[PDB]
DNA sequence: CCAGCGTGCAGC
DNA sequence: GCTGCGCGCTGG
């Protein structure tokens, strides 16, 4: 499965090959603008390039990176616990993991697996992308 | 000036 | 179903 590139330019379109990075991006976009979250995301992935490095991370360090975005302590602690769970739990769908809910699970299901047809999103940009997929289908 | 909002989520 | 978290951003 290769989720196609769209005129919406969802960050998920580039991070689909690495479910962890794609799921971390979803966390970054939780009630936060793309224009704001995305540049911080690249600096985060520079410092914490894998779930292995992030599960070991000190949340206060992650918090300092997340400071301008808001939800800095909640998400720094959520990032660390999510990364640990991501590597320890024997999960099929990421909604089973701490910090991933309907939105991140719908992104995984559209982008990391070929299950978009079964997904019913409720996130603005993801809805636009998902509606566009059903339209430009065949 | 200052309220509303951003590709939510856990926990009660 | 409700509530806390939360900044920086934009607009009457």
Residues 6+ positions from A126 with CB-CB distance below 8 Å:
A10, A12, A103, A106, A107, A110
CA angle A89, A90, A92 (to 5 degrees): 115
Interatomic separation, CA of residue A138 and C1' of nucleotide B9, rounded (Å): 35
Find where tokens 């971390």 sit.
A24
Structural domain that includes position A1: 1-138
Using a 10 angstrom Cβ sphere, with 0-12 exposed, 13-18 middle and 19 or more buried, the burial of residue A30 is middle
Contact A12, A108 (CB under 8 A): no
CA A31 → C1' B5, Å?
9
For the CA of A35 and the C1' of B2, the distance in angstroms is 23
Whether any strand B atom is under 7 angstroms from the Cβ of A123: the reply reads: yes
Residue A49 approaches strand C within 7 Å at CB: no
- CATH number of the CATH domain containing A32: 1.10.340.30
Q: Is the CB of A34 under 7 A from strand B?
A: yes
Way it was determined: X-ray
Query: For residues A114 and A56, what is the distance between their CA atoms, to the nearest angstrom?
Result: 31
With CA atoms as reference, report the closest residue to A107 among A92, A90, A95.
A95
Strand C positions within 7 A of protein Cβ atoms: 4-9
| Structural contact between residues A89 and A97, judged by C-beta atoms closer than 8 angstroms | yes
Structural domains of chain A, count: 1
For A83, phi and psi rounded to 5 degrees? -65, -35
Rg (CA), chain A: 15
């Amino acid at each position: 499965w290769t989720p196609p590139r769209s005129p919406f330019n969802l960050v998920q379109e580039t991070l689909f090959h690495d479910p962890w990075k794609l799921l971390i991006a979803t966390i970054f976009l939780n009630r936060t603008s793309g224009k704001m979250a995305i540049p911080v995301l690249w600096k985060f992935l520079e410092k914490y390039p894998s779930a292995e490095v992030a599960r070991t991370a000190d949340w206060r360090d992650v918090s300092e990176l997340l400071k301008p975005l808001g939800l800095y302590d909640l998400r720094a602690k959520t990032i660390v616990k999510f990364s640990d769970e991501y590597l320890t739990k024997q999960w099929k769908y990421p909604i089973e993991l701490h910090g991933i809910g309907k939105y991140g699970n719908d992104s995984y299901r559209i982008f990391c697996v070929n299950e978009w047809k079964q997904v019913h999103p409720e996130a603005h940009k993801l809805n636009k992308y998902h509606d566009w997929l059903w339209e430009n289908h065949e």
